[PDB]
Amino acid sequence: EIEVKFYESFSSNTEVPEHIHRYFPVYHGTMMVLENLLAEYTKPSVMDVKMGSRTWYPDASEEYIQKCLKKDTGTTTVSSGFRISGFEVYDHKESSFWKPERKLLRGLDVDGARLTLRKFVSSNSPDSAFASSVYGGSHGILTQLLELKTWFENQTLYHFNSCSILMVYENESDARPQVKLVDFAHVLDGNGVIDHNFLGGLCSFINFIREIL
Amino acid sequence: EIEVKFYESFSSNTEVPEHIHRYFPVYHGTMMVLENLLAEYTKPSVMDVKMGSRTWYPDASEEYIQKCLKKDTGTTTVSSGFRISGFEVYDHKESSFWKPERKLLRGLDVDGARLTLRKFVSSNSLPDSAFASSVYGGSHGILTQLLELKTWFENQTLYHFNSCSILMVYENESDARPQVKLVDFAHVLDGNGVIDHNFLGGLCSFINFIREIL
C-alpha cells in the first residue's frame, strides 16, 4: 500500500531527467491522487506486461519469495524477460472490444507470447498489422522502449520489483501509441546498483517487438 | 562435458559477426585442443567473474536447480548482475602474486565487489591505486570490450550462455594489453530466438561498476 512513498519520492526527484518522467503517472499528492492515463483515448487497445526476469526480490519476506517463485515457474517470466498478464483489444471488422481472462494468459509459451504481441496490433480476432504505426515509427513503442532502456542502463536510484509496463494506442480513425510504467507497491532504493532484473526483461521485450517489425 | 558441441557449433557458425569471435577461446578440433589465452602474457593479473542474475536455468534438472539456487543466495549474484569467483594479482611493491581462496569471495557484498574490482587494478595489496585508466579505460580497454559484447547480447538469439564466466586479464610487465573472454561452456544452449537476458542483465550491472570506477 506504500505506492505513496514511491510517488512522494519519485515525482519530486529532480535527478530523474524530464523525458523519463513522462513514462510515469502524474502525481498530484495525497486517498491518492493520480492522472488517469487512458483519459485522452477514445477507443484504446491496452496491454499490460510484467517486467522482470524474476518477480521476487531478495529483500522480500520468506513467504512472498516462495509465492512469486511458483508463480513464475511455467510462464515466460523465466524463459523470457517478462510476462503478458493481460490485454484488451478492438476488432475493427466486428466493432467490438475483447479481452481474455487473465488466468488463461499465465499458460502462454514463447510462441504464444510472440503471437499475442502481434494480435495486439492486428485488426483481426492470420494476424494483420498496425505494427508499423504502433510499434514502429519515429515516435512509436520501440523508440519509447529504447529511451527507457537507455535510462535503465545508468539509473541506480530505484529498483522496480514486481512491476509492469503498459502499452496503449488509439483505434479511432494517428495511433498515438504510448508506454507507461505502473504498480510501485514494491519499488526499492537501488543502492547504487542498476535495476538489472528489469533491464534484462526490457531488452528481451525489446527484441520481441523488433522481430515483428 | 559438452563444451565440444558448442565449440564445434560456435566456431563454424557464420551468423556471429567476426569482431565477436575474438572474445572466445580459439578452437582447432579434436581430447580437446584449445588456444590457451595466458600464453601471450609474461606477468598477468587475472580475474574470473560468474555472469548471471541467476546461475541455474529452466531446462536444467531438479537436482541441479536447487543446487545453484542455494549457491546464489547471499552473494552479489542476486544483488548485482554477477559474482567475482576469483582473481590473482601482482603487487609491484613486493614483486609478488597473491590470490585469495575462492570460498572467501563467495561472501562478498556489493561494497566488497566494488572494492575488489578496484583492487584488481592497483599496484597495492598489503587504500588502492590505479592501472584503472589503462586496463579498464582507454579505447581498447576492458570497458570498450565489455560494451561490444553488450551490443551483441542485445540482439543475438543463437546461444544462451547458462552458468558461464567472464575472464579479464592484463600485462604487468613494467602497455597493459587488457583482454576480455568468456569461458565455461558446459551448459550452453540454443537460445531459441530469445536473447540471453539473464547474461545481458549481469553484463550491464558489471559494465556499470567498472564505469563508476573511471
The domain spans of chain A are 1-213
> Looking at the DSSP assignment, which residues form a beta bridge with residue A181?
A165
**DSSP at A38:** G
Element (H, E) at A46: strand A44-51
Architecture of domain B1-214: 2-Layer Sandwich (3.30)
For domain A1-213, is the CATH number 3.30.70.3340? Answer: no
| Interchain proximity A81–B54, CB inside 8 Å | no
**DSSP at A64:** H
Beta strands in A65-207 (DSSP E): 82-91, 96-98, 158-160, 163-170, 178-182, 187-189
Resolution of the experimental model, in Å, one decimal: 2.9
Q: Which residues contact A3 (CB under 8 A, 6 or more apart)?
A: A32, A183, A184, A185
Q: Is A88 helix (H, G, I), strand (E, B) or coil?
A: strand
- Closest residue on chain A to B78 (Cα): A58
A196-212 vs B142-155: helix axis angle to the nearest 10? 50
The span from the CA of A118 to the CA of A113, in Å, is: 9
Quick check: B10 and B16 in contact, CB under 8 A? yes
| CA of B200 vs chain A CAs: smallest distance (Å) | 6
| Interchain proximity A53–B194, CB inside 8 Å | no
The span from the CA of A140 to the CA of A121, in Å, is: 12
Q: Is A212 helix (H, G, I), strand (E, B) or coil?
A: helix
The percent of chain A in helix, strand and coil, each rounded to the nearest 5, is: 40, 20, 40
The span from the CA of A175 to the CA of B121, in Å, is: 52
Q: Which of A81, A110, A194 sits opposite B208 (nearest CB)?
A: A194
| CA of B208 vs chain A CAs: smallest distance (Å) | 7
Neighbours of B114 (CB within 10 A): 19
Cell numbers for B196, please give them: 540471453
The span from the CA of B50 to the CA of B202, in Å, is: 9
What does the CA dihedral B124, B128, B132, B134 come to, rounded to 10 degrees?
-30
Diameter of chain B measured on Cα atoms: 51
| Interchain proximity B154–A200, CB inside 8 Å | no
Quick check: B56 and B65 in contact, CB under 8 A? yes
Q: What's the full length of chain A, in residues?
A: 213
Neighbours of B143 (CB within 10 A): 20
A→B contacts (Cβ < 8 Å), by residue, are 53-54, 58, 78-81, 110, 153-154, 156, 191-194, 196-197, 199-201, 203-204, 206-207, 211
| Interchain proximity A194–B200, CB inside 8 Å | no
| Interchain proximity B197–A58, CB inside 8 Å | no
The span from the CA of A60 to the CA of B21, in Å, is: 41
Secondary structure, 3-state, chain B = CCHHHHHHHHHHCCCCCHHHHCCCCCECCCCCCECCHHHHCCCEEEEEEEECCCCCCCCCCHHHHHHHHHHHCCCHHHHCCEEEEEEEEEECCCCEEECCCHHHHCCCCHHHHHHHHHHCCCCCCCCCCCCHHHHCCCCCCHHHHHHHHHHHHHHCCCEECCCEEEEEEEECCCCCCCEEEEECCCCCEECCCCCCHHHHHHHHHHHHHHHHHC
Cell numbers for B99, please give them: 590470490
Q: What angle do CA B18, B132, B79 make, to 5 degrees?
A: 80
